[PDB]
């Protein structure tokens, strides 16, 4: 598909998985969204998803505690 | 989030909306997926979504009759 962050990354591009904040293992947020949130204690990792759309601000894909400062 | 087409486009990039195949107005497929499908009769439009992920092959976002030849 096409406030929620509209950022996107490509096949070779990195993003962040956070197992604490994710609704399911396919969820992920862009680097700026991760850096503007607080995951210090969380089980996070840099990934190459092979592309995707950022789930920051999407209550159905990400826990609101894990939203960055700019998306809710 | 990050079978289904994994293609992506950015803020300035075009994609296709197809009102016949879409599950909702936010759904969209990349240009190659549109060209490798059959939408001749359909109510389609070229859009600038401000970025997104291709819904081709996702049955929750796109009608399977509208899948391109390469995603089931
Ligand atoms: Zn983001
Ligand atoms: Zn964010
Ligand atoms: Zn987190
Ligand atoms: Zn169509
Ligand atoms: Zn596609
Ligand atoms: Zn396709």
Curated annotation (Swiss-Prot), chains A, B:
It comes from the Eukaryota. A zinc finger (UBR-type) spans 3-72. Disruption phenotype: Reduced seed germination potential and inhibition of seedling establishment by sucrose. Exhibits abnormal shoot and leaf development. Increased tolerance of seedlings to submergence and starvation. Belongs to the E3 ubiquitin-protein ligase UBR1-like family. Ubiquitin protein ligase which is a component of the N-end rule pathway with arginine specificity, and functions with the arginyltransferases ATE1 and ATE2. Recognizes and binds to proteins bearing specific N-terminal residues that are destabilizing according to the N-end rule, leading to their ubiquitination and subsequent degradation. Does not participate in degradation of proteins with N-terminal Phe or Leu. The N-end rule pathway regulates seed after-ripening, seedling sugar sensitivity, seedling lipid breakdown, and abscisic acid (ABA) sensitivity of germination. This is E3 ubiquitin-protein ligase PRT6. It comes from Arabidopsis thaliana. The lineage of its organism: Eukaryota, Viridiplantae, Streptophyta, Embryophyta, Tracheophyta.
């Amino acid at each position: 598909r096409s406030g929620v962050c509209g950022s996107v990354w490509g096949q070779n591009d990195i993003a962040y998985r956070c197992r604490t904040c994710e609704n399911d293992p396919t969820c992920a947020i862009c680097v700026p969204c991760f850096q503007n949130g607080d995951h210090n204690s969380h089980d996070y990792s840099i990934i190459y998803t092979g592309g995707g759309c950022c789930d920051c601000g999407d209550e159905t894909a990400w826990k609101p505690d894990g939203f960055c400062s700019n998306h809710k």
